[PDB]
Amino acid sequence: MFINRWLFSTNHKDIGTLYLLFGAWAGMVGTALSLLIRAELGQPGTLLGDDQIYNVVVTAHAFVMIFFMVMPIMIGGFGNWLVPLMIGAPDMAFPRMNNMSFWLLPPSFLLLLASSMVEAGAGTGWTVYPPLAGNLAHAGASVDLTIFSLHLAGVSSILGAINFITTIINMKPPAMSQYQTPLFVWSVMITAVLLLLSLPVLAAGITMLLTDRNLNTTFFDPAGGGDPILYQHLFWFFGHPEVYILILPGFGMISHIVTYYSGKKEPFGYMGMVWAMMSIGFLGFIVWAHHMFTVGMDVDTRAYFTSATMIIAIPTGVKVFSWLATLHGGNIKWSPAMMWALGFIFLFTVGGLTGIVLANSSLDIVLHDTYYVVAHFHYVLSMGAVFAIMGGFVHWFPLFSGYTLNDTWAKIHFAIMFVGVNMTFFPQHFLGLSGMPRRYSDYPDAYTMWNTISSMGSFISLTAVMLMVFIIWEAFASKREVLTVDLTTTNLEWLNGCPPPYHTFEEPTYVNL
Amino acid sequence: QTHAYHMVNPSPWPLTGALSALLMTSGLTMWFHFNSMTLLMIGLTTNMLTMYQWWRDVIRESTFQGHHTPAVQKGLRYGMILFIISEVLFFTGFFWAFYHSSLAPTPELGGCWPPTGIHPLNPLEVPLLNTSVLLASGVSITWAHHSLMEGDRKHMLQALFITITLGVYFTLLQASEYYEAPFTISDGVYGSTFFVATGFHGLHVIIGSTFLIVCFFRQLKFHFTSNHHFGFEAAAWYWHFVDVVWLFLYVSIYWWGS
Amino acid sequence: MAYPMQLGFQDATSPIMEELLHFHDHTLMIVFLISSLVLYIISLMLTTKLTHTSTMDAQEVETIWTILPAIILILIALPSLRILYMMDEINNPSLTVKTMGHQWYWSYEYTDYEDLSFDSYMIPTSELKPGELRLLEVDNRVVLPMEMTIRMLVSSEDVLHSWAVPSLGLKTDAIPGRLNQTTLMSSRPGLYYGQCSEICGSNHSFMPIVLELVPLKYFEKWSASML
Amino acid sequence: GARTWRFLTFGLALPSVALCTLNSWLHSGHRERPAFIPYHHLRIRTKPFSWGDGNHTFFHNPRVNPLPTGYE
Amino acid sequence: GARTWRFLTFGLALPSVALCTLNSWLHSGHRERPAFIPYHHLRIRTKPFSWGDGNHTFFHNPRVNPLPTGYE
Amino acid sequence: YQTAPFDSRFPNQNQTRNCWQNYLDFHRCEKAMTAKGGDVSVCEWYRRVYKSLCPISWVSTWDDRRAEGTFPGKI
Amino acid sequence: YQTAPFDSRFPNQNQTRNCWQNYLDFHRCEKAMTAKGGDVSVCEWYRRVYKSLCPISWVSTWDDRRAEGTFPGKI
Amino acid sequence: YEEGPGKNIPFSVENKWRLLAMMTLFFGSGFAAPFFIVRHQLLK
Amino acid sequence: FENRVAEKQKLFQEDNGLPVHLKGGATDNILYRVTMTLCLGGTLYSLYCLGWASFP
Ligand code: HEA
Ligand code: HEA
Ligand SMILES: CCCCC/C=C/C/C=C/C/C=C/C/C=C\CCCC(=O)O[C@H](COC(=O)CCCCCCCCCCCCCCCCC)COP(=O)(O)OCCN
Ligand SMILES: CCCCC/C=C\C/C=C/C/C=C\C/C=C\CCCC(=O)O[C@H](COC(=O)CCCCCCCCCCCCCCCCC)COP(=O)(O)OCCN
Ligand SMILES: CCCCCC/C=C\CCCCCCCCCC(=O)O[C@H](COC(=O)CCCCCCCCCCCCCCC)COP(=O)(O)OC[C@@H](O)CO
Ligand SMILES: CCCCCCCCCCO[C@@H]1O[C@H](CO)[C@@H](O[C@H]2O[C@H](CO)[C@@H](O)[C@H](O)[C@H]2O)[C@H](O)[C@H]1O
Ligand SMILES: CCCCCCCCCCO[C@@H]1O[C@H](CO)[C@@H](O[C@H]2O[C@H](CO)[C@@H](O)[C@H](O)[C@H]2O)[C@H](O)[C@H]1O
Ligand SMILES: C[C@H](CCC(=O)O)[C@H]1CC[C@H]2[C@@H]3[C@H](O)C[C@@H]4C[C@H](O)CC[C@]4(C)[C@H]3C[C@H](O)[C@]12C
Ligand SMILES: C[C@H](CCC(=O)O)[C@H]1CC[C@H]2[C@@H]3[C@H](O)C[C@@H]4C[C@H](O)CC[C@]4(C)[C@H]3C[C@H](O)[C@]12C
Ligand code: CUA
Ligand SMILES: [O-][O-]
Ligand SMILES: [Ca+2]
Ligand SMILES: [Cu+2]
């Protein structure tokens, strides 16, 4: 029975649970990598080694946080648990293929940990640029194991995207139009379209890198008439959509959390929220070369990418203002989830605005490949994507488990993490403006004060992560069973109880025209 | 249940497929770096076993058990369209590589396309024949589809046999052209773009031909009705995709790139 | 170079870096104002027991929410693109210098007249002279004439590097098989430092750039002495 | 109809294949191989191939594919 | 449905037009007219035009369209 | 002659083809002059420009390949 | 020299571009050799080939247009 | 299959001390792994 | 050939509680056991190969 249920699952809830467990474990690996980074940077001079072991750690940190923590939690975990419940569907369209999306991830992760154990690791950056990632400067198996890790993660997500799009289009109640689905459902549909279009281009690019490394192709090798810059275009054609894939499900969760803890039946400006997410998804495909402002492209190309990138602020601002307008007049419940969501709105806005600074190619000359970029993306990832994950986790934990968290412990957790992430990343703006480069194991002495404070921040965040484990233990240890949940009339995922039965919507919902 | 959707029996094939992916990738690593094909041959074997049993079970669920209601069939239609879109974007990456290299040939090539020392195939010889073969196979598969909708078992089988024969002819012609080609995958970015783009296309022709052969044997076994035959529709869509990719390769690499 | 507890950009050494400081000031005012307004509005939405929970009409307010950001973006883009096209303007350099990135050092080529080339390596920490800067000094500095338009061409003989000098507003990637151009003009004599700005392996942290800006007559004599 | 698509299969599509088969047939037969020149952008070897002696491409044809050192 | 096509009209199509209108209205300035050179392949006159003095094109612009003998 | 002037054919950051074109032009000119028994001095401009712009290693590799018979550009 | 040899660049019945290319090449060369004060004897091959192939009225029209400043080819 | 709180998970919550051991091993192994990988790289 | 689909419909609808991957009978169990044995054994071999490749 255990094998049938947990290795042979065709159940969206159990598969969601497997993704959440996987993502939680991946988060601990990513946190340990982040602490090794900050342990090295927290004092001038070399602690670990030369830049190779340091950049193996940096590279692994990014791949783990992105591919093994954020995507599996948001899409595999919250998506599998919530999407079918929010549309009244009895499962996913392809419930057996769903299981293979999950089981491809442990092998993908094993290939990444193999990459770090063999030879000297893949010290490439998560971008894996050639020629450093090629067979001369990174001879041996490490980069090939990294490429194969990404192939398995990519197939996982492509099949997951096919599953989500089909489920959301095809398995709603017949009276329910797309304009009567909850915003989280829209956020997953749009994320899935981005995955479907972007990951195959990554797959093509890393396959070319594999053949350059092993079959004597020269896509990226000037000796054969190749171009390292071609790899960058193919990578970033995926990579910019990838960051929208990381945030969009977060935007969907924030819309549900702000609505719920405002005591509202509905988010402000539903159709504007739908418009905003589709506009962000679309614009996310036409901006990739803002990652390449220093490579030597033509001025008119730089002018276009500056302008197109800045345009994303308009739909994004509609979402931020619509969240504020959802709070407006609310009966505010100061739940731990609400605290995560309010932290998100502010800290995501700050990171989005430093992105607008970077979109300016003239200023990006000085900021590119500095800690200013690192500050930007950690505000949107470590304070945006992560805050949406923590808000959704504490909000929906009672649905998934049938047990309550200790709200006082959860508020303590939030307070510690808020201090730690801000202490970690705020000073990195100063390091960037003053010229500290990325991917350095060591820095000139002038940069010591801000690196010291940043590292102290990272230790506060570690304390928060350890406390979160304890808080989940205390909930399962105490077994406070859920009795009543407010606002079920506008939150269908709660209406089958906590936890919902294995099979829900065996008899579908009745919705007339 | 009082909905029309398919609750699938708990299945081992997702796990066996995921492990086959680990064995194929760790196997390619072992082949490229440790001079051994053992893991790779285990992974290919487990991958083929997994595909066989998974798709066998889909036939059991549909033809034998009746789980493919119109709602389920509509889901599968969306699934196959979305899969084809993902494969189009995969080929787009290779076309991008090709245009990037060919539109701005570097000094190492002689600053020209084709590069100095490359003698392209004549696009009017076997590549034109290959074009006529895949276009003809798009006509014969359409005949097969109409025969099936009109309830004509013999003409469906004849038209599908012709379609498969043409797919095999294309594959044998391409194999011969590979052997005869005076340039190789190691002949710079010309050989790189030529063999990786046409090689992934050739793989898709083999996959599509295999799918058509599965449809041929299912038809021989009377699985398809005149109205319910999604496996055949999916194979035909995939086959048209393979045709269209070829036409883009022919115009881009063989003709405009010569 | 950067100094302890530095908050902003290195002081500008070139007119374009000056332009970038004023453009950053303009942009940062906007970033501050928008961040502050969002924080304030959050605090305003959360500090009343008064409620209004019935459906609210969105279209009027969405006009403000789209038009005002669109105007702000134009007010950033106009000076942004003025600077982008100012750096791209034709200038007429007096001198061309090439730099080639390597694992892990820079070579420099001054071949307008004579075959002058040399390698520039970090001074190891154990060999620093009193008062010298850890990880920033090199054995052979890039001597250049002050107050003159210089064409710098950048490439690599191995992996990617990137040639940066923050106080002049410079960062040009070093790509094998590619010759990237930028212009350098120092308003002042002195020593101007930068660091490799593309991950390039084991000693990425340890291949810095030191420009030495002196009068033309001194540059000419140094050039002759380096042959 | 099926009748129309069969008419197109036998009346247009297969005749086209037969004509192009004739055309390829007529222009077949080995054309002379070009002088070998050891161009540095061709016969790339950055890593030995994982089969044979490491120096032969997968569908190596001795008649028309020289090694880095020239024809066999 | 109609609702979806209206959503695309106002949310994608007309915003695109507005953005292209803004772009055009920024590069609307008059360019410096090029030196007149009496090239034999331009300002063709094989028969007088059937309007005006026979030597002016239908949407002749004095600022940018020289006659065969040059700018007016 | 101080350095290579701005060339409207090559106005962008990527100056690769500017180096290449001047190297080709010098060697084509030198071949055309040495053939008639004319004067390579007429080719000097192309030589100064390619020497200014071209990395030493590119010139050295291209010279080696011209001597080997493996230079892929037309001279 | 008897007449213009076969030129693999222009192998077809339409020889227009062969005449044009050799006229341009002659005049580009003559301008290069005059610019350094080189010697125009170097340009002789091009002159013999265009004189052989080009219609007198084409040569005479092109000459008049170079003198007028209306020749549309780059010399 | 078992339904309800504590039954829709692949781990037991029947004993909070056994659960603490399992959670310790689970999250502790993930957090430890990078330290042991760095040790492994340094010891070559 | 003859249409034997009805005979397969009877076999695969038999109310015997078998999951669809085993409902064909004893051959299904054999092919499942071969597949899972090659998968799990190959996975253990892939881990041995990592152990080996992790050291010089
Ligand atoms: C999602 C993405 C993500 C996240 C969250 C983080 C989080 C952190 N990162 Fe970063 N990081 C990147 C993605 C991320 N990072 C990327 C892409 C790079 C660039 C790589 C390269 O240059 O190639 C990078 C680079 C990078 C650098 C620059 C290295 C250099 O240039 O040399 C530094 C430096 O301090 C850093 C530190 C940290 C720290 C201290 C955290 C901490 O804030 C982490 C604290 C811990 C958490 C936030 C919790 C995690 C766990 C969960 C959320 C699971 C929860 C459990 C349940 C829900 C059950 N990271
Ligand atoms: C979740 C992840 C995520 C998200 C959502 C974003 C969002 C944005 N990013 Fe970022 N980015 C990263 C993750 C993310 N990014 C990562 C990982 C990298 C580094 C990759 C690497 O090199 O490893 C990076 C790098 C990166 C660069 C390259 C810099 C360089 O390497 O030199 C740029 C350039 O333009 C960019 C810009 C933006 C912009 C304009 C947005 C916009 O989408 C932000 C829009 C939001 C707002 C503007 C805030 C809210 C709006 C309002 C309140 C309205 C009013 C506002 C205005 C009028 C301005 N980012
Ligand atoms: C603004 C949007 C587009 C508007 C379309 C055109 C407006 C006016 C004319 C209408 C009819 C056009 C159809 C096409 C015919 C030929 C020319 C039209 C294109 C045009 O308008 O071109 C103008 C010239 O018109 C000219 O000569 C004179 C044009 C008037 C005389 C045309 C007579 C020829 C008619 C031929 C009829 C054949 C019909 C075919 C039938 C086929 C059935 C078997 C261009 O102006 P310009 O000053 O040279 O350059 C601009 C300098 N600043
Ligand atoms: C008739 C057409 C059918 C093709 C089948 C032939 C060969 C095996 C499989 C091919 C699969 C397709 C593409 C893979 C890449 C390269 C092969 C390209 C096609 C080919 O066969 O190219 C040959 C080289 O093969 C080589 O290197 C052989 C290399 C063999 C090892 C392949 C390595 C596979 C790479 C991994 C693929 C990753 C897939 C990613 C999935 C996406 C996940 C997100 C050409 O022969 P040559 O002697 O150089 O020149 C001819 C001279 N007379
Ligand atoms: C040397 C090459 C080795 C590489 C491995 C791949 C090789 C070969 C794979 C060939 C694909 C065979 C697919 C066979 C699917 C059989 C199942 C089937 O066709 O199932 C049908 C459903 O479709 C469905 O699931 C649709 C199922 C579609 C899936 C096919 C997608 C193509 C697979 C691509 C695989 C890898 C490609 C990527 C490479 C980069 C069943 O419904 P009907 O037909 O309506 O029947 C019911 C009626 O009888 C009722 O009256
Ligand atoms: C069902 C489960 C039980 C069965 C387990 C499978 C047993 C297979 C073990 C054999 O191992 C092989 O040994 C060959 C030689 O000993 C290798 O060829 C290698 O060596 C050859 C010549 O020595 C070269 O030509 C090849 O290129 C090269 O890959 C080959 O790679 C490798 O697979
Ligand atoms: C159901 C469980 C799954 C089955 C798992 C089976 C694992 C056992 C395979 C035997 O291992 C092999 O040992 C060979 C040692 O003889 C290796 O030969 C290879 O390495 C040799 C080293 O001597 C070289 O001669 C050649 O590259 C080559 O023959 C080969 O790589 C390796 O596979
Ligand atoms: C027409 C469409 C859907 C309306 C509906 O069917 O409910 C609505 C939803 C979101 C709207 C857009 C968003 O509110 C953002 C913009 C707001 C501006 O005031 C008009 C243009 C603007 C781009 C809007 C146009 C249009 O009214 C949209 C696209
Ligand atoms: C005799 C048999 C009847 C099938 C049936 O109705 O059961 C016929 C009908 C259609 C025939 C097939 C088609 O005529 C197409 C092919 C024709 C070739 O000449 C033989 C193989 C070939 C693939 C045939 C095999 C076999 O004779 C089939 C399958
Ligand atoms: Cu050189 Cu980093
Ligand atoms: O990617 O921002
Ligand atoms: Ca340190
Ligand atoms: Cu981006």
CA distance G34 to G28: 10
CA distance A465 to D20: 69
Chains touching chain B, criterion 3+ CB pairs below 8 Å: A, C, D, F, I
On the 0-12 / 13-18 / 19+ scale of CB atoms within 10 A, I17 is exposed
CB contact at 8 A, C206 and C199: no
Ligand 3 in contact with E60 (CB < 6 A)? Answer: yes
The residue contributing the CA closest to ligand 5 atom 24 is B231
Is CATH 1.10.287.90 the classification given to domain C2-91?
Answer: yes
Q: Which residue has the tokens 């484990």?
A: A469
Ligand 2 in contact with A128 (CB < 6 A)? Answer: no
CA quadruple B77, B79, B82, B88: dihedral, nearest 10: -90
Resolution, given in Å to one decimal, reads 1.7
CA distance A494 to A397: 11
CB contact at 8 A, A272 and A314: no
**Which residues are bridge partners to C101 per DSSP?**
C106, C156
What is the layout of strands, in order, in the sheet containing C150-156?
C116-120, C105-110, C95-102, C150-156, C180-184
Gap from G67 CA to chain E (nearest CA, Å): 12
DSSP one-letter string for H1-44: ---STTTSSSS--SSHHHHHHHHHHHHHHHHHHHHHHHHHHHH-
CB contact at 8 A, F3 and F49: no
The answer to the question of whether C26 is labelled as a binding residue is no
The answer to the question of whether A151 is labelled as a binding residue is no
CA distance B45 to B25: 13
CB contact at 8 A, A296 and C175: yes
CB contact at 8 A, B98 and B193: yes
Does the active-site annotation cover A290?
Answer: yes
Q: Which residues of chain A neighbour I53 with C-beta distances below 8 Å?
A: 114, 117-118, 141
Does the active-site annotation cover A255?
Answer: yes
Q: Which residues contact G39 (CB under 8 A, 6 or more apart)?
A: F38, F39, G33
Q: Which residues of chain A neighbour E11 with C-beta distances below 8 Å?
A: 275, 278-279
DSSP one-letter string for A53-69: HHHHHHHHHHHIIIIII
Burial string for A322-338 (b: 16+ CB within 10 Å, else e) reads: bbbbbbbbbebeebbbb
CA distance B78 to B90: 19
On the 0-12 / 13-18 / 19+ scale of CB atoms within 10 A, F61 is middle
SS3 C223: helix
CB contact at 8 A, A277 and E11: no
For domain C92-227, give the fold.
Answer: Immunoglobulin-like (2.60.40)
Write down the catalytic residue from A115, A146, A156, A279.
A156
Query: What type of residue sits at position A149?
Result: S
CA distance E20 to A149: 42
Inter-CA distances, A144 with A137, A232, B40, I46, Å: 13, 18, 15, 15
Kind plus residue range of the DSSP H or E element containing I41: helix I26-53
D residues 42-71 closer than 8 Å to A (CB): 44-47, 49-50
For domain A2-513, give the fold.
Answer: Cytochrome C Oxidase; Chain A (1.20.210)
Nearest ligand, measured from the Cα of A166: 5
Q: How many CB pairs under 8 A join A and F?
A: 7
CB contact at 8 A, B236 and B141: yes
**Which residues are bridge partners to C163 per DSSP?**
C172
Kind plus residue range of the DSSP H or E element containing C153: strand C150-156
SS (H, E, C) B194-254: HHHHHHHHHHHHHHHHHHHHHHHHHHHCCCCCCCCCHHHHHHHHHHHHHHHHHHHHHHHHH
Question: What are the φ and ψ backbone dihedral angles of C190, each rounded to 5 degrees?
Answer: 135, -160
Question: What are the φ and ψ backbone dihedral angles of G66, each rounded to 5 degrees?
Answer: -55, -45
Domain with CATH 1.10.287.90 in chain C: 2-91
- What radius of gyration, in Å, describes the C-alpha atoms of chain F? 13
G8: left (phi over 0), alpha (psi -120 to 50) or beta: alpha
Q: Do A14 and H35 touch (CB under 8 A)?
A: no
Query: What type of residue sits at position I10?
Result: K
Q: Which of D40, D42, D44 to mutate to test the interface with A (most CBs of A within 10 A)?
A: D44
| Residue A506, number of CB atoms within 10 A of its CB | 11
CA distance C159 to C176: 7
Q: What residues line ligand 5, using a CB cutoff of 6 Å? A: B 51, 55, 58-59, 62-63, 68, 76, 80, 83, 206-207, 210-211, 214, 223-225, 228-231, 234
DSSP one-letter string for B80-102: HHHHHHHHHHHHHHHHHHHHHHH
Write down the catalytic residue from A233, A411, A438, A439.
A438
Nearest partner of B101 among B191, B189, B196, judged by Cα: B189
SS3 C101: strand
Nearest partner of C64 among A321, A312, A309, judged by Cα: A321
The tokens describing A18, both together, are 């497997």
Q: Which residues contact A476 (CB under 8 A, 6 or more apart)?
A: A401, A403, H6, H13, H16, H19
How many residues can be counted in chain F?
Answer: 75
Does the active-site annotation cover A291?
Answer: yes
List the domain boundaries for chain H. 1-44
What is the layout of strands, in order, in the sheet containing C190-195?
C142-145, C208-214, C190-195
Domain with CATH 2.60.40.420 in chain C: 92-227
Q: Which residues of chain A neighbour C9 with C-beta distances below 8 Å?
A: 366, 433-434
Write down the catalytic residue from A157, A181, A259, A504.
A157
Does the active-site annotation cover A371?
Answer: no
Write down the catalytic residue from A12, A13, A38, A61.
A61
* Alpha carbon of A314 to ligand 8 centroid (Å): 12
By what technique were these coordinates determined?
X-ray
CA distance E67 to E42: 10
**Which residues are bridge partners to C118 per DSSP?**
C108
Q: Which residues of chain I neighbour H44 with C-beta distances below 8 Å?
A: 55-56
Q: What residues line ligand 1, using a CB cutoff of 6 Å? A: A 20, 24, 27, 30-31, 34, 37-38, 58-59, 61-62, 65-66, 69-70, 73, 125-127, 374, 378, 381-382, 385-386, 389, 393, 421, 424, 438-440, 458, 461, 465
CA quadruple F27, F30, F33, F39: dihedral, nearest 10: 160
Q: Which residue has the tokens 């092109």?
A: G62
CA distance A378 to A374: 6
Residue of chain D with shortest Cα separation from F69 = D37
CA distance A270 to A266: 8
* Alpha carbon of A380 to ligand 2 centroid (Å): 8
Nearest partner of E72 among E63, G70, E40, E37, judged by Cα: E63
CA distance C162 to C195: 8
The answer to the question of whether A244 is labelled as a binding residue is yes
The answer to the question of whether A429 is labelled as a binding residue is no
